[PDB]
């Protein structure tokens, strides 16, 4: 019938759900202090509306980037790995991994906090790209993302040592193809026996349609402020919605699992490493 969060916890402890696939969005990283620049005001948003931006999405479109890359690099400075720590939400996913329950983590985020939390690259699909590598927009030469950090943190537009063209981190912009590693979804979502969706409004495609790729018998658990996407307008009989604060929803599931003090210990140890 209609499942509960407790019911999901029982399937996880019973290893009836042993191949969990996870989809995450910006909602799991604002608790780390990453400013939600999508939100009007507060505040980078208002400071960054001072450019001649046609629309706010042009910060992630190549035609505008070629015109003026300064808006992008201003925002990159602040999202760049190294200034933020993962939060309980990230460490919950690392704990699933430690317990051998995590089949794959699909992330829309570019803050790199999944890798930092201790999830290995083999278990991760960074569907919208990464700051870990960069590419000259003129000659197409690839670089390690480390090669541009100093320029980025210093408010300088990084330029290519070969042709002096603008070097762009390997973030997927709107209109660009997703990395071919995204094709793992063809195998991962049918192999899933549970789908978790955390902290996203499912407004970016093709990522959002992955919610539909699990088999008919597979529960889909949404932990999110709002009911969104196919869980709103194409619900299935084993869907579960834990609507509210993402951190609160996760911690409630951790409690029903019986993992609260294992989580506390894990978080304390890993954040201390900084």
């Amino acid at each position: 019938g209609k499942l509960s969060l407790q019911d999901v916890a029982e399937l996880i402890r019973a290893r009836a759900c042993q191949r969990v696939v996870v989809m995450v969005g910006a909602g799991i990283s604002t608790p780390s202090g990453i400013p939600d620049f999508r939100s009007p005001g507060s505040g980078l948003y208002s400071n960054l509306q001072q450019y001649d931006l046609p629309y706010p999405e042009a910060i992630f479109e190549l035609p505008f980037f070629f015109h003026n890359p300064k808006p992008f690099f201003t925002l990159a400075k602040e999202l760049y790995p190294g200034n933020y720590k993962p939060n309980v939400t990230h460490y919950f996913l690392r704990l699933l991994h430690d317990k051998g329950l995590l089949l794959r983590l699909y992330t829309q985020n570019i803050d790199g906090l999944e890798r930092v939390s201790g999830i290995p690259a083999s278990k991760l699909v960074e569907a919208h790209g990464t700051f870990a590598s960069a590419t000259c927009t003129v000659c197409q030469r690839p670089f390690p993302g480390e090669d541009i950090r100093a320029d980025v943190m210093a408010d300088r537009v990084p330029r290519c040592p070969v042709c002096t063209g603008v070097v762009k981190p390997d973030i997927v912009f709107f209109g660009e193809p997703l990395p071919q590693r995204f094709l793992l979804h063809v195998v991962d979502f049918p192999m899933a026996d549970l789908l978790l969706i955390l902290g996203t409004s499912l407004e970016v495609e093709p990522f959002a349609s992955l919610t539909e790729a699990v088999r008919s018998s597979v529960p889909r658990l949404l932990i999110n402020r709002d009911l969104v996407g196919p869980l709103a307008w194409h619900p299935r009989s084993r869907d579960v919605a834990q609507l509210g604060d993402v951190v609160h929803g996760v911690e409630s599931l951790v409690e029903l699992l019986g993992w609260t003090e294992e989580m506390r210990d894990l978080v304390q140890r890993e954040t201390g490493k900084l």
Binding site: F173, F174, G175, E176, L178, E203, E205
Partner: peptide
């Protein structure tokens, strides 16, 4: 060379 989209593509 297209695929990513939001709110209209």
């Amino acid at each position: 060379t297209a695929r990513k989209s939001t709110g209209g593509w």
